[model samples]
Target: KVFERCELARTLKRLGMDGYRGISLANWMCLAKWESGYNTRATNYNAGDRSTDYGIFQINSRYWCNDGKTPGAVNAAHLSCSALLQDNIADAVAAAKRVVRDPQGIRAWAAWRNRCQNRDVRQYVQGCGV
Candidate 1:
């Protein structure tokens, strides 16, 4: 399937994220590309086993299906497209902003990519223009 940047941008916009600026769009695209090659349906096999993590952001089932009681928190499958669309985009933007403002996460992303050497990974180097 084709990767839908416009759809992503629209989703981000609806989540109170300025798709044209800030860490929202850039980080969303970066994570999606690194994790799943922008394939929303992508799944990864683990340890020669068939178990997998699915979707563009590669959210594990554990996180997706959190046992927490929060109204908005539940199994990812229970989340409507609207909710997933909103939550994922909003969460990514928030995390990206935090990483941008803090040096530690920035170092971690860098170290992660350096060790993995995956071309799919995109780096938002500090002060490098988000």
Candidate 2:
């Protein structure tokens, strides 16, 4: 949750995603709440497939932090559990900005809404106001 609001916003601004800077803070917080329920250690368990997704945003552990090989993999625990426990906020911010600037604006919840229907989680994010 901390990363979503502060770190993520700062990172986006730094990356020049300031186009909607006015609403960044509230928008990010909304995304954090919906994505992981403010739980850094939150995970999604698939009973049918017997699978588990981990971390605050429920990023698949295997793809990002399974062996802690990614740039911020080792600090995954810190990013999800506590802001102070993480490696460097700058790294986390960079990761988030990369997504936001992606061709589809995948990092922005609103963009995701345009791509998928039920997955349009951006509505919740927009409720936070700009």
Candidate 3:
């Protein structure tokens, strides 16, 4: 499902993923903008390999998920990668929450590292009232 950033924020906020318990909305929203452009079904296969990143957060197959194509691969969220690629973002939000709790925190997401960290991304959620 193609969703506006604010809609994603509103949905995520309702899903218990808004800048609390180590998950920051600005960070997530900013990363999502870069990673998936807020598209729920977005998926990307890295140019380096067949490994893919799934959903709004681009949760990577290299570690966070298997993407079904690699069973021996790590599945940190212990979830079906297909589950992340859905119109309803609730599952993706849950998986992301798990990722944020990791030792690396939100830095687990490269987009956050490259664009969101130590930055003021308040503009992403400026008016949604999240």
Compare the candidates by TM-score and give the number of the best one.
3
Q: For residues 1-130, what per-residue lDDT tens digits would candidate 2 score against the true structure? A: 3444444445445645444423344454455456665455565655654444544444433322343423333332333323312434343344444345545443444422544433533454343233
What local distance difference test score does each model get? 0.45, 0.43, 0.81
Model 3, 1-130: lDDT tens digits are: 8888788889878887776566678877898898889887888887676688888788878777766685457888888889899898877888888887778887777778788888889999999987
Deviating ranges (above 4 Å) for candidate 3: 47-49
RMSD of each: 8.3, 7.5, 1.6
Number of colliding residue pairs in model 1: 0
Q: Lowest summed lDDT over 10 consecutive residues: which window, candidate 2? A: 76-85
Q: After superposition, how far is residue 72 of candidate 2 from its true place, in Å?
A: 20
Worst lDDT 10-window in candidate 1: 78-87
lDDT of 1 by residue, 1-130 (tens): 3355556645555665444333344455565556766565565544443233545555433334332433344353433322223324554444344334544433334433544344432342223333
Tell me the deviation in Å of residue 34 in model 2.
0.5
* Cα lDDT for residue 108, candidate 2: 42
Score residue 28 of candidate 1 by CA lDDT: 51
Ranking by TM-score: 3, 1, 2
